[PDB]
Design a protein around this ligand. Structure first.
Ligand SMILES: CO[C@@H]1[C@@H](O[C@@H]2O[C@H](C)[C@@H](O[C@H]3C[C@@](C)(O)[C@@H](OC(=O)CC(C)C)[C@H](C)O3)[C@H](N(C)C)[C@H]2OP(=O)(O)O)[C@@H](CCO)C[C@@H](C)[C@@H](O)C/C=C/CC[C@@H](C)OC(=O)C[C@H]1OC(C)=O
Ligand SMILES: Nc1nc2c(ncn2[C@@H]2O[C@H](COP(=O)(O)OP(=O)(O)O)[C@@H](O)[C@H]2O)c(=O)[nH]1
Ligand SMILES: [Ca+2]
Ligand SMILES: [Mg+2]
Length: 297
């Protein structure tokens, strides 16, 4: 039934699949992901829409993907060869995700040892992020991404914090920590860049040597503080993993400043802002309680 639907929607877009290879991913509030080979044996990823207004809701994301596909050489991103209101499809990237969330345990199934991360993982991620963050988004004729100057990125965080406080409240010590960070001029970066915005193991494609070769799921891409793309490395691999990533990024020519590590640690402490915003917009009860606990109220 579902399989038959996939074949027909693909046919309508001139995509012809080996039926025996069709596999459905879990879930889908926005899109159902489906994996399948075409008749030449090439692996594809299909996204079946579950909501209206597909094109307007993907416009910005496609702009980001277009930038990456135009400028990047050391990593892949989805290239939506089929892009319509009825189907988005791209050839599957090389490699495997460094970890994939399994919801029946509430954590990743990892492809690397988090207690002994290969050095090449941090080195290659630093290369990839440095390349990404230096893409010249200004050379596009139209850009509807959110774009922040360094000053605007700081003001954005300040305003987002106030809005969360107004809605949920924030614990007193946590709020004071946030304000001390906002107020420390020396902490803040003097350059912004095109970011992925949701870098974590499930979106990070690696080869057999744990060299990063691609990134998927670009819905959170924008031009802002680059520091967001370092957060997961810290959260998963601790200060050592954060330092290793910063070192690689610096040494290949990424923008570095003396308080970069400290700033990223403070941004991590501001993660409750993000979970609170997601709880609000999504309406999902589980994230509402997670938000309240994270905000220390
Ligand atoms: C992929 O991240 C997951 C989480 O899963 C994500 O929980 C987010 C809150 C969702 O959302 C994301 C993106 C975002 C854009 O929605 C963002 O929202 C915003 O910034 C604001 C918005 C208005 C633009 C929000 C804060 O985080 C993601 N889903 C629903 C999209 C969802 O991944 P999943 O689907 O793959 O499961 C987590 C639940 C919620 O924390 C999975 C769960 C099984 C949990 O038991 C497992 C926890 C593992 C801990 C170890 C650590 C190294 O691992 C991570 O650090 C990854 C982890 O993150 C966190 C902070 O622990
Ligand atoms: N190996 C691999 N997995 C992919 C690829 N594209 C999507 N996936 C898998 O499909 C899942 C969902 O795709 P994603 O673009 O993140 O969509 P989401 O469900 O909206 O978050 C990912 O978490 C990956 O496990 C790809 O190119 N390669
Ligand atoms: Ca997404
Ligand atoms: Mg995803």
């Amino acid at each position: 039934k579902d399989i038959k639907q996939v074949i027909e929607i693909a046919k309508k877009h001139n995509l012809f699949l080996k039926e025996e290879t069709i596999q459905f991913n879990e879930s889908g509030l926005d899109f159902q992901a489906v994996f399948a080979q075409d008749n030449n044996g090439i692996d594809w990823v299909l996204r079946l829409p579950r909501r209206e207004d597909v094109m307007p809701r993907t416009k910005v994301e496609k702009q980001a993907l277009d930038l990456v596909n135009k400028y990047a050489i050391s990593f892949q991103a989805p290239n939506w060869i089929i892009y319509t209101e009825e189907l988005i499809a791209y050839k599957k990237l090389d490699g495997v995700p460094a970890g994939t969330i399994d919801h029946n345990i509430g954590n990743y199934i990892w492809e690397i040892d988090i207690n002994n991360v290969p050095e090449l993982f941090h080195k290659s991620l630093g290369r990839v992020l440095a390349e990404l963050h230096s893409i010249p988004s200004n050379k596009a004729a139209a850009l509807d991404l959110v774009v922040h100057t360094p000053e605007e990125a700081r003001m954005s965080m300040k305003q987002r914090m106030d809005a969360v406080r107004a809605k949920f409240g924030v614990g007193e010590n946590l709020w004071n920590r946030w304000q001390a960070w906002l107020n420390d001029d020396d902490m803040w970066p003097k350059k912004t860049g095109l970011i992925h915005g949701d870098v974590h193991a499930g979106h990070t494609m690696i080869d057999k040597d744990a060299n990063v070769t691609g990134l998927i799921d670009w819905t959170e891409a924008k031009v802002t503080d680059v520091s967001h793309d370092f957060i997961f490395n810290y959260r998963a691999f601790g200060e050592e993993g954060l330092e290793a990533l910063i070192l690689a990024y610096k040494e290949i020519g990424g923008y570095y400043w003396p308080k970069m590590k400290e700033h990223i640690i403070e941004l991590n402490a501001a993660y409750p802002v993000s979970i609170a915003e997601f709880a609000l917009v999504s309406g999902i009860e589980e994230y509402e309680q997670m938000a309240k606990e994270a905000l220390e109220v």
